[PDB]
Design a protein around this ligand. Structure first.
Ligand SMILES: *[C@@H]1O[C@H](CO)[C@@H](O[C@@H]2O[C@H](CO)[C@@H](O[C@@H]3O[C@H](CO)[C@@H](O)[C@H](O)[C@@H]3O)[C@H](O)[C@H]2NC(C)=O)[C@H](O)[C@H]1NC(C)=O
Ligand SMILES: *[C@@H]1O[C@H](CO)[C@@H](O[C@@H]2O[C@H](CO)[C@@H](O[C@@H]3O[C@H](CO)[C@@H](O)[C@H](O)[C@@H]3O)[C@H](O)[C@H]2NC(C)=O)[C@H](O)[C@H]1NC(C)=O
Ligand SMILES: CC(C)CCC[C@@H](C)[C@H]1CC[C@H]2[C@@H]3CC=C4C[C@@H](OC(=O)CCC(=O)O)CC[C@]4(C)[C@H]3CC[C@]12C
Ligand SMILES: *[C@@H]1O[C@H](CO)[C@@H](O[C@@H]2O[C@H](CO)[C@@H](O)[C@H](O)[C@H]2NC(C)=O)[C@H](O)[C@H]1NC(C)=O
Ligand SMILES: CC(=O)N[C@@H]1[C@@H](O)[C@H](O)[C@@H](CO)O[C@H]1O
Ligand SMILES: *[C@@H]1O[C@H](CO)[C@@H](O)[C@H](O)[C@H]1NC(C)=O
Ligand SMILES: *[C@@H]1O[C@H](CO)[C@@H](O)[C@H](O)[C@H]1NC(C)=O
Ligand SMILES: *[C@@H]1O[C@H](CO)[C@@H](O)[C@H](O)[C@H]1NC(C)=O
Ligand SMILES: *[C@@H]1O[C@H](CO)[C@@H](O)[C@H](O)[C@H]1NC(C)=O
Lengths: 37, 212, 316, 158, 320, 34
């Protein structure tokens, strides 16, 4: 009930943090590749 | 203060055409004019009294009703069902909580007396009464869930009401739970986005370990 | 002279609005010019009669005439006992009426089942039945039994039954004497409840009409039929009344009534009333060919004593 | 510290694009799934003030313009993306005010709710409350990113 | 010669619950008719009362005018049913009427609809099956619409409709729908809807062939019994082991059809215990003269579950 | 049912967290080596 909803909200926040870190890694790899090219 | 409580007083969620019904908000015996916002069928009606007295119910007067008194919240919506039947099983509720009560009645068309009424639950009769009066089922259990109907005799003619499923539940179904399925769904895009932001991160890294 | 005072009345013509019921007090055999007819309702006067004593006929000293009373409809719907008072030779005579009280108050359907002829003329222990159907519950129903002659009455056996349609039924079975049923004793079942407006009074008697003794014939299983079952047939025809018992036997041993059927009795030829039934007993081929016999006995109240007519079927 | 923020500036606009698209998704599921006449106009102050739509538009627009201004370094994208970040920070501040007012209204509603699952009202109010909570988290993220674009693109011109 | 109309009254005795006969004494009085030119007949809801021997008693004679009455004895529960008892007075070929009911209140007596399937005689022998929807206890004909709907096809035939004004001031509407036979063997479910402006919804009856395992009747015709040397001869047709109970039975005297008034058929009785078979008896009692004149009687039986052309007849003859 | 559907997504997020930590050390090692 309440515990599942709270845990699912923190799962969503985990998804937010993971897509932010993956976007930062994406721009870092793209900047390294556009410096290499 | 609290939420509004819209309440019929003839408390029958199923009425026939021409039945006088009155829609009361939070609840007193006073038609407090210009003090209640009435929403019928998700559209704000011009009736602003605390008592919405429908003196003759129309099929158009069915559907959803919400009251909101001045200084109060919007109500839990009640569903009137104005019907056009030879014999109607009136009920005070369609979903009843456990340890709760509900009345049923067997009404015919425009104050015609129903006589020799048999009330059935799932084709099994539980009560016979000549005068069509209240059958007050107090302290409802899961036994009291079922497809209730009633057979009556008209001015001399046997007619059978349409069945009506009255469900007894531990707690009300709250009809919007998939909204809490929005957030795990918005994980299975975002996490899947991560898989894209893994794969297109790996391949561009796979192309950067080859050049050295 | 004793005038014959029967009282008649009009009632609802369905094809008319009919605001007035026409009460009528008829007197026959009274002495000519020696009649005074007055009307009362609930044993109080009506001088508002404007009575029209219409003379019918004269036969020497004797005479016949009648009076008519207009009443409104709600004076009749009140179930008020109207009455006619006749003064003849100084003597007084009374005629009573009211509306026929509702035979099903609160929708309670009361059946007065007569004794079966098997109980009356073979078992010797007849039993009337008052079947009081469509009750809300069996509390405060009192069932009274009324005879004609004797204050002594048998003790009724009352049982109750809540049915599949949640209707309580009360079966009050009164053991009666067969002799008084032959003589024509009248028996009432009066169902009474605190909020019945009036008691349910059902009356029953031995059924009136000319008694015709049944002719009973038994037909062999058909000669084309050499199949696995053999059907035995009993024609019972030209009998009044409808109340008849038919039994099937196997070598003077009684077959149960669930093994043979009997048709609903059908009226025949008019205008004096006669009935016919067919009793049908289906047996197997093995049970038919066991070197035996079957009989069809018929118990009826138009048969000579002991009111049992046997017709035997056998292949030997 | 100027070079410490230019390396992450593209991500610092991608977070605005992300917050805007999740704002748009929350707005379209509230607009489509909910029958908003059933619920109060102060519980639904998020949607009645329209914040997910004009927040989604401005966050997506400002983040996208910041992405292209980082990827092109054009003198017309800069001071064009700076104004987009100014209006994004203004919209995010108004959004933070709207979301605090909606948490206040949702607490005032849930005072008269003995359970989260009494009916549709308390349940939709609780769902809106924690959606306001994780829109407040995203709006704080987008507002901090908007302030960081403002700080970088103003301090560069000093 | 002028026709003189007589005053026709319809009086009766009432209930005496303290009495024991349980019988209502209806009287129809006729005043002002012509001597030896009156006939009073009795009806119970348009049904003529034959089995009563209703007694006709003269009252008086005033020149060429006369007064008589007729007495009808009815059962208590016949009166309590609120059935109209009608005396029809025929004088000079003119019919005068009086009606009576038990006096009831102003309740609006409801409408009873029966949907009646076609006879097997029309289904499998005449080839012209007709459904009929009988609508009863209408206070008037007006604004009643009787419609017919099928289930599979749309080619609904021209449903004729007639109306009867009964003696009990109720109007009946009998709507005849001619149907095709092969649709009814194949199992078409037809449906009659009766609609009025004062009805909530139409009174709807639905019908089809009776479901169950079909069984051909075997029929056996018995002779008049060997002990019968009387003046009448009874012929029995035992019709056995059939489903459904919808069956048509005719008697044939030398292949000439006998009308249904001269023979009587018992109601179908079920047996075999959920194997669902039925039996009837057709009884034709002829005179001894009609039997001894070397005729040849036949019990023709038309049932659904028979081999084509769905009649199965049995010869019976005196000589053979 | 929400407990199993959330546990499988925590596992599905732990997988991507391990993949992100695997890519982070490789990117920082390439950044160390020019
Ligand atoms: C509720 O169900 C009961 C039982 O199914 C119904 O009782 C039955 O009522 C019928 C007619 O009212 C009775 O038939 C009558 O039988 C008597 C005696 O055999 C006969 O003389 C009459 O001519 C008539 O055929 C039947 O016996 C009776 N069943 C029993 C077991 O007593 C009752 O009518 C139903 N009530 C309602 C309101 O539906
Ligand atoms: C007024 O008088 C009419 C005419 O007699 C009454 O109509 C009759 O009503 C009975 C039952 O209500 C009908 O019997 C039914 O017949 C069908 C067809 O055979 C059968 O399938 C049913 O099971 C039932 O036995 C009868 O046919 C019908 N007579 C006519 C000529 O239509 C009517 O009931 C009377 N109403 C009052 C209030 O007195
Ligand atoms: C309803 C919500 C939960 C879904 C919205 C989230 C994602 C669809 C979006 C939001 C912003 C997007 C990011 C915006 C900008 C970028 C930079 C972009 O850069 C390139 O296009 C690289 C060009 C090249 O490969 O040469 C790569 C995708 C990425 C990380 C996007 C990945 C997908 C993201 C996370
Ligand atoms: C309010 O909504 C109800 C349905 O929830 C409407 O009732 C329907 O009315 C139409 C014709 O108007 C009927 O054909 C339906 O059978 C009705 N449905 C039910 C469930 O009753 C009602 O008309 C609406 N009223 C207004 C004013 O819009
Ligand atoms: C109580 C009683 O016997 N009532 C009548 C009787 O008066 C009448 O003579 C007879 C003939 O119909 O019918 C019966
Ligand atoms: C009958 O039922 C109605 C509606 O449920 C209710 O308002 C009323 O109080 C009841 N009365 C009795 C006597 O049960
Ligand atoms: C409810 O129904 C079940 C199943 O018939 C039965 O066992 C149980 O006793 C019922 N409950 C009550 C309170 O009687
Ligand atoms: C009684 O009524 C009839 C018809 O309603 C009328 O002709 C007659 O004059 C009336 N008689 C009296 C005395 O009121
Ligand atoms: C019945 O039909 C007539 C036309 O034949 C119409 O004028 C009338 O309004 C209808 N209704 C009633 C109640 O008479």
């Amino acid at each position: 009930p309440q515990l599942c909803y709270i845990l699912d909200a923190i799962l969503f926040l985990y998804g937010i943090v993971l897509t932010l870190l993956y976007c930062r890694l994406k721009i870092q790899v793209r900047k390294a590749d556009i410096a290499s090219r | 203060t609290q939420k509004s409580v819209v309440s019929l007083d003839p408390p029958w969620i199923r009425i026939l055409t021409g039945d006088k019904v009155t829609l009361i908000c939070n609840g007193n015996n006073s038609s407090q004019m210009n003090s209640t916002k009435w929403i019928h069928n998700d559209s704000i009606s011009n009736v602003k009294s605390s008592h919405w007295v429908i003196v003759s119910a129309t099929i158009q007067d069915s559907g959803k009703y919400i009251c909101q008194k001045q200084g109060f919240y919007k109500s839990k919506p009640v569903y009137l069902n104005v019907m056009q039947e030879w014999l109607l099983l009136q009920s005070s509720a369609d979903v009843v909580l456990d340890n709760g009560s509900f009345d049923i009645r067997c009404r015919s068309w425009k104050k015609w007396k129903v006589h020799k009424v048999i009330y059935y639950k799932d084709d099994i009769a539980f009560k016979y009464s000549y005068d069509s009066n209240n059958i007050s089922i107090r302290k409802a259990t899961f036994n009291d869930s079922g497809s209730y109907h009633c057979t009556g005799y008209l001015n001399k003619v046997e007619c059978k009401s349409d069945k009506f499923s009255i469900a007894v539940v531990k707690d009300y179904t709250i009809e919007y739970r998939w909204l809490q399925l929005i957030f795990p769904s918005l994980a299975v895009i975002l996490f899947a986005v991560d898989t894209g932001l893994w794969f297109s991160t790996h391949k561009q890294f796979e192309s950067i370990l080859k050049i050295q | 002279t004793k005038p014959t005072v029967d009282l008649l009345h009009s009632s609802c013509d369905p094809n008319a609005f009919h605001s007035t019921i026409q009460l009528y007090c008829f007197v026959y055999g009274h002495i000519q010019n020696d009649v005074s007819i007055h009307w009362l309702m609930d044993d109080r006067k009506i001088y508002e009669t404007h009575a029209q004593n219409v003379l019918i006929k004269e036969e020497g000293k004797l005479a016949s005439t009648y009076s008519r009373l207009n009443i409104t409809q709600q004076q009749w719907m009140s179930e008020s006992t109207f009455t006619c008072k006749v003064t003849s030779q100084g003597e007084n005579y009374w005629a009573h009426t009211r509306r026929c009280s509702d035979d099903e108050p609160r929708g309670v359907i009361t059946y007065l089942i007569p004794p079966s002829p098997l109980d009356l003329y073979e078992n010797g222990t007849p039993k009337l039945t008052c079947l009081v159907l469509d009750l809300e519950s069996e509390e405060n129903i009192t069932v009274t039994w009324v005879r004609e002659r004797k204050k002594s009455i048998g003790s009724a056996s009352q049982r109750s039954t809540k049915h599949h349609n949640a209707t309580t039924s009360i079966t009050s079975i009164l053991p009666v004497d067969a002799k008084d049923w032959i003589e024509g004793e009248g028996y009432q079942c009066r169902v009474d409840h605190p909020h019945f407006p009036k008691p349910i009074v059902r009356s029953i008697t031995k059924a009136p009409g000319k008694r015709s003794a049944p002719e009973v014939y038994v037909f062999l299983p058909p000669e084309e039929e050499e199949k696995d079952k053999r059907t035995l047939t009993c024609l019972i025809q030209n009998f009044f009344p409808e109340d008849i018992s038919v039994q099937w036997l196997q070598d003077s041993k009684l077959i149960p009534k669930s093994q043979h059927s009997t048709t609903t009795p059908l009226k025949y030829n008019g205008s004096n009333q006669r009935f016919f039934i067919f009793s049908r007993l289906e047996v197997t081929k093995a049970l038919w060919t066991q070197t035996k016999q079957f009989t069809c006995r018929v118990i009826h109240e138009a048969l000579r004593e002991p009111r049992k007519l046997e017709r035997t079927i056998s292949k030997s | 510290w100027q070079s410490f923020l230019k390396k992450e500036l593209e991500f610092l606009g991608v977070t605005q694009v992300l917050v805007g698209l999740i704002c748009l998704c929350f707005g379209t599921v509230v607009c489509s799934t909910l029958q908003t006449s059933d619920f109060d106009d102060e519980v639904l102050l998020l949607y009645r003030a329209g914040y997910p739509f004009w927040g989604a538009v401005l966050f997506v627009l400002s983040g996208f313009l910041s992405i292209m201004s980082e990827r092109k370094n054009t003198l017309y994208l800069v001071r064009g993306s700076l104004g987009a970040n100014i209006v994004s920070s203004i919209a995010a501040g108004l959004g933070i005010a709207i979301l605090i007012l909606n948490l206040s209204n949702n607490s005032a509603y849930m005072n008269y709710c003995k359970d989260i699952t009494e009916d549709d009202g308390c349940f939709v109010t609780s769902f809106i409350t924690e959606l306001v909570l994780m829109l407040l988290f995203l709006t704080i993220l987008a507002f901090c990113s908007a302030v960081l674009l403002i700080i970088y693109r103003i301090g560069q011109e000093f």
